[PDB]
Amino acid sequence: QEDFFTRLQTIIDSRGKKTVNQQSLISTLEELLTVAEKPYEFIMAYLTLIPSRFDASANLSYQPIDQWKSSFNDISKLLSILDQTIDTYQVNEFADPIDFIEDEPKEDSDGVKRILGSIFSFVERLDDEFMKSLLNIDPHSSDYLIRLRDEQSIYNLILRTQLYFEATLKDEHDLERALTRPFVKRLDHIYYKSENLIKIMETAAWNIIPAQFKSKFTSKDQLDSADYVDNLIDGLSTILSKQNNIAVQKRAILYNIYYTALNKDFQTAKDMLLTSQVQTNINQFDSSLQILFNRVVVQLGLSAFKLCLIEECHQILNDLLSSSHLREILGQQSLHRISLNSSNNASADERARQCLPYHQHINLDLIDVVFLTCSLLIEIPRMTAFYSGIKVKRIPYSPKSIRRSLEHYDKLSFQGPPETLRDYVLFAAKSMQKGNWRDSVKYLREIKSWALLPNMETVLNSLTERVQVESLKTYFFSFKRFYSSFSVAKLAELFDLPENKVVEVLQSVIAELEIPAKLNDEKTIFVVEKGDEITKLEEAMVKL
């Protein structure tokens, strides 16, 4: 007894002294676990053993794979002991006292959250240091893949610790307070993945858990259902609206919109966003959650584009994609490059916690090509109109846009066959201008980014169509000067657009732009060249 208490206390006191050998401090605690038999001895040993490790490796870049792997063993062992104890270590409820032997530490304080809450924090360290490894490893080395293999095992501990918290805690006000955070971590480890990969992590997490079950969702029974995953997400989602921390509520809402905008229909997501009412909020809630909001904005900008809504897409992305620094604003930047910048390390934790690991990255080239394809289909006919002599619809002046980069490509001394993706998009634009839609589609299919979409064929043909339409428009706009008359049959055949579309587009456009053009539906023929802007000025001079 008193041997054990006196040892342990001597160690804890010696730890609060500056010069210490942390290797020897760890090895001593362990060699004194060897002696311990009684359970309070074990638990009180581990409770100061885990942070003793984390503290030992604390001032490094991260704790290496071996020390992390053994500290996991520690937390799992304390958990196995607390599990085999089954809450009976506290002498039930009516009698709280931890008494044996509280006199030796003398520093005990009544609580559950106080003594048994610290547990969660331990788990969190395992996770946090873990992330610090994924940031600091080489993105493409196999090591990164191995670390990511460890992610699953952390998710395990999240679920297990959750379940022990459910069995132990008898006060719902405390149980909620305790559960909010591991629900949060649990969410962070799910939403960016596919329903499959998530149900893998979940299944794998449930297989390592024994006869202990208390949970609201009741997954052990319902594991195989297809409504499983969705109900988990919306479950923890609805839970986190209870908690009073605003960053937590917005966090939750944003995880919802992300997951949903991936594995569910776009309209649901849009509804969620406009109903959720976070605007003046997001600006003041610091960096990481803004990274999250920009991530979900990107995601709905992406799925809306998968739906082949161009008008919607360009609406969604313009604010965030006008940013020069967008790569940083999405929280993706190599840690190293800003690790030299941010030093000293004390305040470097701040900027380094802001960037994200690789598997959570949204490829920027995909996003940029997407938005630029949009800004193309949108801005090209209106431009063609304007500079070939019709300006009724034009007052865009376009910030950081496809048009400006057109103006800068025209001014180059050298014009090379396209290599960078913006050049392929470019060639597609000029192709539209001259009226070869085939060429434009060809140049657009040479872009690599389209391969990251699981629906790629569908959007290939969908885009081929929307491009057929807009390029028909553009053609008409540019060439109406030298053509007095047109044939809907020929035009229809050559653009590969059925006449119903042709007459519709052309008529609608001429009616919207007030163009001096006349269509006979009966013979399917069109007429122009009357004029003008200047001729209306001739007329205005003549009347008065």
Partner: protein, 271 residues
């Protein structure tokens, strides 16, 4: 220091030379161009001038880069400057001399027509700093400088001189068609021809367009397409030909109106 200076300059120059050649062989045209700038300015600074092998390979690269650039004149020039250097090499086969002279003459033919003015500043002009050219040696000037030179005209394949006769010796539309029928069969036999079909075709068809605008000023479209149509290698879809004309028209070579209601094209010149 001047020794270490001269050596380091030489190192850096050769370095850029192979950055150019590797880039071109690796199909990176921007790094190629940028490195070529780097070469030009270096030689301007350099005291010791390059070894002939490196310059020959330099033009050997420049010809490709200016091919894909869309500027036929620079292409032609660097291709000439490859000739002038290659006549000095001990292994020179008559087949090769013939091939290259031929190709030079073709690139002169393929050239877009410089006669109709370009309003505004052409950025491409800056590139001419690179080849010593102060301004563009108009398609005329190219034809002259080529036939003027002994070896060049001398080694050209007969089919191509014949082509130059088809196009530039009293060209009449139908007769040019008939001449092209026979001559293309004899012409396409030879290796060099593969690459020049498109710009050549466009030049021919431009000539056709202007001659048609002069000879008859109001016509049915179906009557125009027959004249505009060319033989086998130059064949084009109907609307493609329509747009070749469109090109020529927007280029302000011919001022045109078209009424398709009656399937008519009207050429009116009221200058």
């Amino acid at each position: 220091v001047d020794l270490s200076d001269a050596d380091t300059l030489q190192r850096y120059l050769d370095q850029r030379f192979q950055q150019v050649d590797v880039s071109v062989k690796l199909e990176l045209w921007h790094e190629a161009y940028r490195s070529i700038e780097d070469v030009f300015h270096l030689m301007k600074i350099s005291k010791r001038a390059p070894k002939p092998s490196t310059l020959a390979n330099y033009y050997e690269n420049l010809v490709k880069v200016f091919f894909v650039s869309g500027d036929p004149l620079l292409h032609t020039t660097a291709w000439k400057k490859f000739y002038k250097l290659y006549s000095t090499n001990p292994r020179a086969t008559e087949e090769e001399f013939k091939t290259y002279s031929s190709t030079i003459f073709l690139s002169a033919i393929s050239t877009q027509l410089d006669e109709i003015p370009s309003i505004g500043y052409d950025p491409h002009l800056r590139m001419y700093r690179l080849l010593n050219l102060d301004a563009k040696p108009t398609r005329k000037e190219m034809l002259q400088s080529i036939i003027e030179d002994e070896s060049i005209y001398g080694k050209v394949d007969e089919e191509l001189k014949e082509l130059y006769d088809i196009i530039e010796v009293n060209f009449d539309v139908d007769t040019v068609k008939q001449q092209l029928e026979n001559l293309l069969v004899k012409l396409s036999s030879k290796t060099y021809f593969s690459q020049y079909i498109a710009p050549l075709r466009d030049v021919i068809m431009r000539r056709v367009f202007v001659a048609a605008s002069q000879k008859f000023t109001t016509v049915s479209q179906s009557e125009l397409y027959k004249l505009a149509t060319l033989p086998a290698p130059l064949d084009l879809s109907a609307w493609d030909i329509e747009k070749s004309l469109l090109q020529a028209a927007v280029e302000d070579y011919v001022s045109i109106t078209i009424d398709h209601e009656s399937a008519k094209v009207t050429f009116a010149k009221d200058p």
